[PDB]
Amino acid sequence: LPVLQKESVFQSGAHAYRIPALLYLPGQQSLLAFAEQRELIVLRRGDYDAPTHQVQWQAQEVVAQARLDGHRSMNPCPLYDAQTGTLFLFFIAIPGQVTQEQQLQTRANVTRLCQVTSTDHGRTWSSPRDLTDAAIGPAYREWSTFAVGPGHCLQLNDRARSLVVPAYAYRKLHPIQRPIPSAFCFLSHDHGRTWARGHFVAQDTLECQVAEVETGEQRVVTLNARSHLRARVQAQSTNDGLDFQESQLVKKLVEPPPQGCQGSVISFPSPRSPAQWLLYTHPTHSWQRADLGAYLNPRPPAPEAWSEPVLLAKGSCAYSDLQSMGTGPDGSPLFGCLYEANDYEEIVFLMFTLKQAFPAEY
Ligand SMILES: [Cl-]
């Protein structure tokens, strides 16, 4: 398909950069591209230059605040709070080396849920805040580890403008069997002051992302997760992510077994009747992490409504993250996509419009 921009934003022959996260700032009309650097989190800011309809990426910088002493930082999970304008960067912190506790108990949970916030459009960040105890509580010792995202988080359009952070945890349900992962959501109605841990979806679900859409008559949260099956796993919640209805397989969205691959999903105003449509990116190969494709769902989150994918990039492609960026030069919705490519040797930024990706719609 034709695109507005394709630029490698992170590069490393040593596969130093992985796990992309993208965040669009609507007022500034800029993007924040995060990635893990093999471990800390790095960032590149880029302003959408209207006159040239290109994002001008600035110099890479380390998010020095997004780290705990003696820990490795991973899984950048950003969010823009529309009510306050504050930016949240959730992330995971794990000890850099085996701890004394782990020496005695191999599966002891030593993973930390953290966050740093910014009130100046991501130019500077607050000291890190460990949210582990407040968000997970007593369930903490029941897991071997867990993670959030990777990729952008969600803010609902409810009265409270609730924050929903997608996540997954490896549950130590059997002392002999290896811990099995299950996706879920963290939910806050007060801009991160308090957190609730939602119930798990089906077992063996891993990196997931959530979006909010209108279906039937009200708004629901759709969770789209990586699986070890041949198709993606999806589930919807009518209570902001605290409880999900029965998980379902989305056969139209392929997953390459046995490992599967992380994928991204976002909602955006319908170009036309449903209020929102969904856009999702993930490799399209039946058993390899290759050929990144963009898929559209005009009647979300109905599994049967997903479109055939449009090829965004041929060849090796892995994790990705999407962000809507307002209206494009051609008048249709503008999108930004950050994805791993070329055997993890780089992270590429792609910017395109709905008209470019899905011509038939126009
Ligand atoms: Cl902004």
Curated annotation (Swiss-Prot):
It is found in: Cytoplasm, Cytosol. SUPFAM superfamilies: Sialidases (SSF50939). Changing Q259E: No effect on enzyme activity. Its EC number is 3.2.1.18. Optimum pH is 5.6. Disulfide bonds: none annotated. Gene3D superfamilies: 2.120.10.10. Keywords: Carbohydrate metabolism, Cytoplasm, Glycosidase, Hydrolase, Lipid degradation, Lipid metabolism, Repeat. GO terms for molecular function: exo-alpha-sialidase activity. The active site is at Y319, E340. One of its GO terms (biological process) is oligosaccharide catabolic process. Expressed in skeletal muscle, fetal liver and embryonic carcinoma cell line NT2-D1. One of its GO terms (cellular component) is cytosol. It is an enzyme of class 3 (hydrolase). Exo-alpha-sialidase that catalyzes the hydrolytic cleavage of the terminal sialic acid (N-acetylneuraminic acid, Neu5Ac) of a glycan moiety in the catabolism of glycolipids, glycoproteins and oligosacharides. Recognizes sialyl linkage positions of the glycan moiety as well as the supramolecular organization of the sialoglycoconjugate. Displays preference for alpha-(2->3)-sialylated GD1a and GT1B gangliosides over alpha-(2->8)-sialylated GD1b, in both monomeric forms and micelles. Hydrolyzes monomeric GM1 ganglioside, but has no activity toward the miscellar form. Belongs to the glycosyl hydrolase 33 family. This is Sialidase-2. It comes from Homo sapiens (Human). The gene is NEU2.
